[PDB]
Each structure stands twice: as C-alpha cells, then as structure tokens.
Amino acid sequence: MNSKHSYVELKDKVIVPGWPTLMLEIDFVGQFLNIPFLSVKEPLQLPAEKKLTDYFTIDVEPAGHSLVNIYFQIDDFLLLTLNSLSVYKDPIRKYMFLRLNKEQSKWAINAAFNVFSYRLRNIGVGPLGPDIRSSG
C-alpha cells in the first residue's frame, strides 16, 4: 500500500584506512570544504553525458548553535554504484546525512548554508596503503 522515510547518518565506519577514498568537495557561494565521503575499491566514474547533480541532491542545515549537518538524497543509480565501489559493506541509503565537526560547521554557518557547487573526487592511497589495509 503506502510508504515513507528517514535520514540515516553515514558514520565514520565507512572510511577505512588503507583504501582509496571519494572526497565530497563543497564550494560555498561564492577554499572549498573537504569531507572524506566513502572509502572505495575502484574510482567513481559516471556516464560522461551525466553529471553528479543529476543523481545527488545535497543540503546543508544547522543542528545547533555551533554544529551543522549535510543531508543528501541519492538516486538509485548512484546508490547502487556507490554500494558496489564501497569497502564497507553496502552503507548507502537513499536518504542519509553527515556530521560536520565544530570546525567544518563554522564555514557553512558563515556561508548561510548556501551551496555554490559540489562534487565527488577520487583520491589515491599513499605509500603504505596496501600494507595498512592488509594488516590488523
């Protein structure tokens, strides 16, 4: 019959040291703000015709007098894509959120929560990556 939802935190568990990582870069209207988003096995490339906004809506809101969160909504194609690239076991829901720290929040607050643009961005591992991931 009838259905509706909720915004799950995407916790720090999904970033796993040793592995490559996707970096959410937020450029405030008008010194980006960089959040490691999700540790991945292979880089994210999208259909070249397409672009991230097609698949990924985000929104920055305060959570209190000092802290701020980033909410977002992930169309299924990206959701499925992200889950397959993900090291941590399929952690991406359609409606999720993310906690900036007292530090990160501060910028967002000053920009009046107003996003000019954003993108994801594949970043490689450093010289001890393979050794880090495989030990433990």
Side-chain angles (χ1 to χ4, degrees), residues 39 52 136:
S39 269
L52 182 59

mmCIF file of all heavy atoms in Angstrom, residues 39 52 136:
data_model
loop_
_atom_site.group_PDB
_atom_site.id
_atom_site.type_symbol
_atom_site.label_atom_id
_atom_site.label_comp_id
_atom_site.label_asym_id
_atom_site.label_seq_id
_atom_site.Cartn_x
_atom_site.Cartn_y
_atom_site.Cartn_z
ATOM 1 N N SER A 39 35.133 5.189 1.550
ATOM 2 C CA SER A 39 36.322 4.515 1.100
ATOM 3 C C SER A 39 35.867 3.538 -0.017
ATOM 4 O O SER A 39 34.871 2.825 0.126
ATOM 5 C CB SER A 39 37.039 3.833 2.294
ATOM 6 O OG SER A 39 38.017 4.684 2.924
ATOM 7 N N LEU A 52 27.001 14.713 -11.646
ATOM 8 C CA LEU A 52 26.590 14.302 -10.293
ATOM 9 C C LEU A 52 25.231 14.849 -9.805
ATOM 10 O O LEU A 52 24.448 14.135 -9.130
ATOM 11 C CB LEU A 52 27.682 14.695 -9.302
ATOM 12 C CG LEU A 52 27.450 14.300 -7.847
ATOM 13 C CD1 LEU A 52 27.287 12.783 -7.673
ATOM 14 C CD2 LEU A 52 28.586 14.861 -7.000
ATOM 15 N N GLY A 136 46.323 -5.908 10.493
ATOM 16 C CA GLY A 136 45.275 -5.701 11.513
ATOM 17 C C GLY A 136 44.485 -6.961 11.842
ATOM 18 O O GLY A 136 44.843 -7.717 12.754
#
